Design a binder for this molecule. Structure first.
Ligand SMILES: CO[C@H]1O[C@H](CO)[C@@H](O)[C@H](O)[C@@H]1O
Ligand SMILES: CO[C@H]1O[C@H](CO)[C@@H](O)[C@H](O)[C@@H]1O
Ligand SMILES: CO[C@H]1O[C@H](CO)[C@@H](O)[C@H](O)[C@@H]1O
Ligand SMILES: [Ca+2]
Ligand SMILES: [Ca+2]
Ligand SMILES: [Ca+2]
Ligand SMILES: [Ca+2]
Ligand SMILES: [Ca+2]
Ligand SMILES: [Ca+2]
Ligand SMILES: [Ca+2]
Ligand SMILES: [Ca+2]
Ligand SMILES: [Ca+2]
Ligand SMILES: [Ca+2]
Ligand SMILES: [Cl-]
Ligand SMILES: [Cl-]
Ligand SMILES: [Cl-]
Lengths: 149, 149, 149
């Protein structure tokens, strides 16, 4: 019994792992995930940057980061409104970095942005035009998470 | 060996349980669930109240119940059309109670409602503009389920 | 006690099987599955027929097949654009068969179709008004999968 039941449960476990992978694939498909493309998702809720980060972290994803013009448009279409991007200059003013680490490679700043306006702006939002504007991390904008291709 | 294999499998099971909970979270998020708010969802199918209760129960949820104006609006946006709410006055006429227990607190009745029209109306539907109208439990309306915050 | 841990493991696994089944039911419900009806899903991606077949098969479904007018309307709403159906006359020119086996019965051909136009057309797309047109399997149309009732 013992060894047999143990061997059976290993098979039951592997079977459940396969089924759950399948469920995840179907869910990504249903949410618009395109072959070989990373995918962005939103619950359409607007909140402070720190809350977006914590929320995407729970889902094992990251705050949406467009690495090129295609991903930038993709994020725009998903959000439908202003949304925080996974980019800030919180560590060194004027120097924007990805929350996943590293200096910017692609950017689509609105004219004369980023400007750290008034009391200060260390976060970034993609606006209803695809362009970027640095804004207060305390302001509430749409939460858009990103998952791997 | 045996004790080690069993321990390693108990660890795989724990990881799998966490992954499934993550799948449930991502799904709810993708379907619009707001932080600290109940999750309302519909398949857009109209059916009698008895069936809506059976369906939500099978999904381990319950028929949608608006506890306040905010939830009422959230349910309205999800339903899109007339939908049953988890409220009835089957016990004492005029005394509406939640299907999960307790007396009705918040309400958003339409002018001249509830009227227990004709042979009687002991169920409730959220209709145009989010107002409420009591209706026969045998009539078919949209099935909207709620899941905890 | 080895046997006590094994019995708990069995209970943990069964609880997980039940919870995954509920997650799948809730997802299908959230995607619009009507009671006792098969349901359709699309990621809105356009690709050649062989890829759509591969994708749906990997998700344990099949390329969508309208068996009647209701299902045809349901597929049309989901697709929003031209989409391949699980119907072809690849095996014997002129005789359309379901990819899962059997001769085509219900059909919704546009006037003057199917016509195996030019070098040939062995696949089928649901297009404008939900009518059908036979087209080259190499063309790229929206991927729509169907899952059992
Ligand atoms: C007044 O502040 C706002 O407008 C300026 C430009 O006018 C932006 O730079 C800033 O981030 C705010 O959105
Ligand atoms: C005729 O019955 C219907 O219309 C009245 C108001 O006109 C409602 O109160 C009732 O529930 C039914 O919807
Ligand atoms: C030119 O070919 C296109 O148009 C004809 C009818 O005009 C269809 O039958 C065919 O599949 C193509 O869509
Ligand atoms: Ca600063
Ligand atoms: Ca700054
Ligand atoms: Ca700015
Ligand atoms: Ca009554
Ligand atoms: Ca009544
Ligand atoms: Ca009434
Ligand atoms: Ca042929
Ligand atoms: Ca011809
Ligand atoms: Ca043909
Ligand atoms: Ca044709
Ligand atoms: Cl800031
Ligand atoms: Cl009634
Ligand atoms: Cl062909």
């Amino acid at each position: 019994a013992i060894e047999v039941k143990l061997a059976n449960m290993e098979a039951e476990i592997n079977t459940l792992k396969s089924k759950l992978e399948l469920t995840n694939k179907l869910h990504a498909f249903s949410m618009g995930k395109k072959s070989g493309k990373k995918f962005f998702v939103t619950n359409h809720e607007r909140m402070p940057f720190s809350k977006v980060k914590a929320l995407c972290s729970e889902l094992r994803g990251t705050v949406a980061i467009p690495r090129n013009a295609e991903e930038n448009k993709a994020i725009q279409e998903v959000a439908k409104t202003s949304a925080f991007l996974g980019i800030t200059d919180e560590v060194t003013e004027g120097q924007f970095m990805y929350v996943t680490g590293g200096r910017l490679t692609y950017s689509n700043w609105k004219k004369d942005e980023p400007n750290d306006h008034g009391s200060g702006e260390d976060c970034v939002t993609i606006v209803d035009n695809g362009l970027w504007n640095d804004i207060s991390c305390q302001a509430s904008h749409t939460a858009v998470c990103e998952f791997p291709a």
